[PDB]
Design a protein around this ligand. Structure first.
Ligand code: SRM
Ligand code: SF4
Ligand SMILES: O=N[O-]
Ligand SMILES: [Cl-]
Ligand SMILES: [Cl-]
Ligand SMILES: [K+]
Length: 538
């Protein structure tokens, strides 16, 4: 690698970071959008106020403003559903560690309630909230309303640092390694500039996913994050070994690799900053399929990339990885659904199944009511698109289990539902090839009617090769495709994946059988469960 390759390609100009004039050749169209107008100005210079007043039909008549609503608004967490729900915006938060309050939940419910049939909300595979139905004229008021209740939607889409994932049992599990909340909180504060915007990390070549591990279970999926903090003691000091570059895409899925770096616990933010600066400064900005950070690591080599991180650390210090980390390889991932005692004597948490992560406003209000009546007004989201209500006095559990809403959001649903994960799909997502959420529920219900089993089989449904629902981690994964029935008619189908493992002994699954019509999946899956996962026909 020539020394010229290491020249930073972006520069700070008037509070924002822009590609240098000599590093603009051959850039992709998204890079051109970012140069044409700085997306962060919509928030930081209140550009949204005037934009929101322009009728959408008028907005669509010019490239600049159409790009504002279709692309730049993703820096404010707003996602125009142009193809499948025209004129409506999905809105996505920052929610470090998946932690929400009842007041925040009620606020979000109040926003979606306004939109009637166009509104609903979803828990995401980064333990985050998305709300739906938003119209552009309401955006300024919603941004103000979010801030009022202590929420931000900043930098949650496009070429930004995505939701910092942590241990859903942080602070409450007797078996936790380290409470991840302080760290994910710090990361989110750093990323968003304390909810004011942080332009230093908002012009990346591509999206970038961070997580902080605090569980032996590895609930945080460190193997598939761009930066994963693995708790590790080194030379008598608590800190983190760092894994880098994990990612999924249509073209390529790769597990994170060791940076060969350990940082003291207090250096979590400094090293996040150093890694992001190196990625921002040096990353490829051509073909979008080759812009994730792993591609830079491969170009420089991991040692070459490490040197770039090291030079950007305070005092240019970056220790080598600790020989061992604190995560115990002797471990079985634990079910968190149901009632579990906390480390605080006399308290329990309850994990509740949210079918395919989908809720309506009334459901949100009810969950918020439960968290207030039974817990501490806290609702935690999980990456399987479920919830945990922590901090419940154990003597209240008997009454809680009788609450009518628990018949819908159950502490003990059938085992296949416990592990079911599904992306948005074509109800709202323009890239989706198939409908996912309704279909996956229907198929799973039919499968479980036919077989019983005791193994916690994890089934993931994703609507297109972007694999937002992570089919490569599943015991059985389903990737949307179009295929053909016996008469040659177009039908929805799935490419079926097998081989995904999570926890310490992680492994990426691969296509097992292509082009299976969705209407033919039940017998295939029933047989796979009996033959490979110990299921028994009813
Ligand atoms: C909501 C969510 C799936 C869900 O049902 O839970 C989701 C939904 C979408 N993803 Fe994703 N992704 C979601 C997690 C993921 C993950 C999983 C993860 O983070 O562990 C991945 C795979 C892992 C990874 O990225 O390394 C993922 C890979 C993508 C990709 C492919 C990235 C790539 O490098 O090629 C895109 C397309 C892109 O960014 O170019 C995409 C694009 C999109 C968009 C924003 C596309 C769009 O504008 O329509 C989807 C919005 C649909 C909608 O209305 O909801 N989404 N997306 C997840 C939101 C997470 C969050 O709260 O921030
Ligand atoms: S996997 Fe495809 S269909 Fe599903 S939410 Fe992601 S982009 Fe949309
Ligand atoms: O928002 N899915 O990258
Ligand atoms: Cl995006
Ligand atoms: Cl679209
Ligand atoms: K779920």
């Amino acid at each position: 690698v020539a020394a010229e390759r290491l020249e930073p390609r972006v520069e700070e100009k008037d509070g924002y970071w822009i590609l240098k004039e000599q590093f603009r050749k051959g850039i992709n169209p998204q890079e051109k959008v970012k140069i044409e107008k700085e997306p962060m100005k919509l928030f930081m210079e209140n550009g949204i106020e005037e934009l929101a007043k322009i009728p959408i039909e008028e907005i669509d008549q010019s490239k600049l403003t159409k790009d504002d609503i279709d692309v730049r608004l993703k820096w404010l967490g707003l996602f125009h559903r142009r193809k499948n729900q025209y004129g409506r915006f999905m809105m996505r938060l920052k929610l470090p560690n998946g932690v929400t309050t009842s007041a925040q939940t009620r606020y979000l419910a109040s926003v979606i309630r306004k939109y009637g049939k166009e509104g609903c909300a979803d828990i995401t595979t980064r333990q985050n909230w998305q709300i739906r139905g938003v119209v552009l004229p309401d955006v300024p008021e919603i941004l103000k309303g979010l801030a009022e209740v202590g929420l931000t939607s900043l930098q949650s889409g496009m070429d930004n640092v995505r939701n910092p994932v942590g241990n859903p049992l942080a602070g409450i599990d007797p078996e936790e390694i380290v409470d991840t909340r302080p760290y994910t909180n710090l990361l989110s504060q750093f990323i968003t500039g304390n909810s004011r915007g942080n332009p230093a990390v908002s012009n990346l070549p591509r999206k970038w996913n961070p997580c902080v591990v605090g569980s032996h279970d590895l609930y945080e999926h460190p193997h598939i994050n761009d930066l994963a903090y693995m708790p590790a003691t080194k030379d008598g000091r608590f800190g983190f070994n760092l894994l880098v570059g994990g990612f999924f895409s249509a073209k390529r899925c790769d597990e994170a690799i060791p940076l060969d770096a350990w940082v003291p616990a207090d250096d979590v933010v400094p090293v996040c900053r150093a890694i992001l600066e190196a990625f921002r400064d040096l990353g490829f900005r051509g073909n979008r399929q080759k812009c994730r950070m792993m591609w830079l690591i491969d170009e420089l080599g991991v040692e070459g990339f490490r040197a770039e991180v090291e030079k950007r650390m305070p005092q240019q210090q970056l220790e080598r990885a600790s020989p061992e980390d604190l995560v115990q390889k002797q471990w079985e991932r634990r079910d968190y659904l149901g009632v579990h005692p906390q480390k605080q004597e006399g308290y329990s948490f309850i994990g509740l199944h949210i079918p395919v992560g989908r809720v309506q406003a009334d459901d949100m209000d009810e969950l918020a009511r439960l968290a207030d009546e039974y817990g501490s007004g806290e609702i935690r989201l999980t990456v399987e698109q479920n919830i945990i209500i922590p901090n419940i006095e154990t003597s209240k559990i008997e009454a809680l289990l009788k609450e009518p809403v628990l018949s819908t959001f159950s502490p003990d649903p059938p085992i296949l539902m416990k592990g079911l994960v599904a992306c948005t799909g074509n109800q709202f997502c323009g890239q989706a090839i198939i409908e996912t959420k309704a279909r996956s529920l229907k198929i799973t219900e039919e499968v479980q009617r036919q077989v019983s089993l005791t193994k916690p089989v994890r089934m993931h449904w994703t609507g297109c090769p972007n694999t937002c629902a992570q089919v490569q981690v599943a015991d059985i994964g389903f990737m949307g495709c179009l295929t053909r029935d016996k008469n040659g008619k177009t039908v929805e189908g799935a490419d079926v994946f097998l081989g995904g493992r999570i926890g310490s002994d992680s492994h990426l699954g691969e296509v097992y059988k292509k082009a299976v019509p969705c209407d033919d999946l039940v017998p295939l899956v029933v047989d796979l469960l009996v033959n490979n996962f110990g299921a028994v026909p009813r």
